[PDB]
């Protein structure tokens, strides 16, 4: 096993490095331009090719193949850390969600002194402030598999499949993080979701409610919540 910090640094340098490919016949900083577009709302998802990474390090590619989800999360965090560096201007036009993000960051700067102790529960969830998605492209060397032969040995791996579509679900919003407001305080509570079903909270974990022992009760909000687009697909063999 390897420490995640070293590989995170390697991911950051890989994102900062490549200059090679250009369509018009030149040498163009592709990932830098992608990141600059990502800084504002000019691109809301990023796709990473695992063929380009293979030039410098194949062990990274293998570890990504066998442990894909952890590496997806690491890539997301690395890109989020890189985003402030490439930012050059404020948003020309922004929507409701950006308004929440800006307001929350502004009051975080207003309140939190650099020296005061902050509880691990007092931080913002990572994915709430984030607004970009990362996806992977299958290796060209990797051979597409067959629906019949994917089994327990393939659970958790990265695979590529070819099939025929038979059933598609209509688009409906899916919850990512739920936002709660206390009955007797101005604090905000965040509940991440990683289950098909979840149980909404009741009492307020905010520090003021704890100190006063007021017993304030939480309420859901839909505006503050984060939602994603979700679809369900059915595939069959050739």
């Amino acid at each position: 096993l390897k420490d995640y910090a070293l590989e995170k640094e390697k991911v950051k340098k890989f994102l900062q490095e490549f200059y090679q490919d250009d369509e018009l016949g030149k040498k163009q900083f592709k990932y830098g331009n992608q990141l600059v577009r990502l800084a504002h709302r000019e691109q809301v998802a990023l796709y990473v090719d695992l063929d380009d990474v293979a030039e410098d390090d194949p062990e990274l590619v293998d570890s990504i193949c066998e442990n894909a989800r952890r590496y997806a999360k690491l890539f997301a965090d690395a890109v989020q850390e890189l985003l402030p560096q490439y930012k050059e201007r404020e948003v020309v036009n922004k929507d409701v969600l950006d308004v929440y993000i800006e307001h929350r960051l502004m009051m975080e700067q207003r309140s939190r002194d650099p020296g005061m102790v902050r509880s691990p529960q007092n931080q913002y969830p990572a994915e709430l402030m984030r607004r970009f998605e990362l996806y992977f492209q299958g290796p060209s060397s990797n051979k597409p598999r067959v629906i019949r032969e994917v089994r327990a040995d393939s659970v958790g791996k990265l695979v590529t499949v070819r099939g025929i579509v038979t059933r598609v679900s209509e688009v409906k919003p899916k919850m990512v993080v739920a936002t709660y407001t206390c009955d007797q305080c101005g604090a905000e509570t965040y509940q991440p979701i990683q289950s098909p079903t979840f149980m909404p909270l009741i009492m307020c974990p905010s520090q003021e409610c704890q100190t006063n022992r007021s017993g304030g009760r939480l309420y859901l909000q839909t505006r503050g919540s984060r939602f994603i687009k979700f679809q369900e697909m059915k595939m069959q063999e050739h």
Binding site: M199, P200, I202, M203, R213, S214, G215, R217
Partner: protein
């Protein structure tokens, strides 16, 4: 159970159905198939499986919080605060039921003096055989035989039973067969009305 009448239907709408509740003496009346007026109250009764999605609900005003090992999680927290789902339905309680439009001795006693006068005036007229034919079917031309047959079927015969356990019919059945457009459904509609 009661239903909204046809005359109150708007465009392209199915009649509305409502539940009526009778208590004590008013329980007797309002048999099935009737067309009646009700007078009473409109009252709200709770329901169970109305809300597939969370809605309005009750709770307690006491500012009570949990303790370690007894934290107010989902089920225990909901049971501790006495949370109930506010679901409701509309139910009508009736205190007066009447016919919309209103044992020979009983029938005679029910009728007033003027109604009995009219009945007696009708009774001793031979033209009762003729005038009843024209009254029920003013617009249909001819076919007086069918009118007489329908009137005879309406009045009907007398049922009897024998000593061997058999029974004898007392009713009359009528069939009409004809060429198209010979007012064949008009008789059916007039008898229905």
């Amino acid at each position: 159970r009661i239903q909204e009448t046809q005359a109150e239907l708007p465009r392209g709408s199915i009649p509305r159905s409502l539940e009526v509740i009778l208590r004590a003496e008013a329980v007797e009346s309002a048999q099935a198939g009737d067309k009646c007026d009700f007078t009473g109250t409109l009252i709200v009764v709770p329901d169970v499986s109305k809300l597939s999605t969370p809605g309005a609900r009750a709770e307690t005003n006491s500012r009570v919080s949990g303790v370690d090992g007894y934290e107010t999680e989902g089920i225990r927290g909901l049971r501790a605060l006495g949370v109930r789902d506010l679901s409701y339905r509309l139910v009508f309680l009736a205190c007066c039921v009447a016919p919309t439009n209103p044992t020979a001795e009983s029938i005679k006693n029910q009728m007033t003096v003027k109604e009995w006068e009219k009945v007696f005036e009708m009774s001793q007229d031979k033209n009762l055989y003729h005038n009843l034919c024209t009254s029920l079917f003013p617009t249909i031309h001819g076919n007086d035989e069918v009118k007489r047959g329908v009137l005879l079927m309406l009045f009907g015969g007398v049922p009897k039973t024998t000593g061997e356990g058999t029974s004898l019919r007392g009713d009359i059945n009528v069939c009409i067969v004809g060429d198209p457009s010979t007012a064949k459904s008009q008789f059916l509609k007039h008898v229905e009305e």
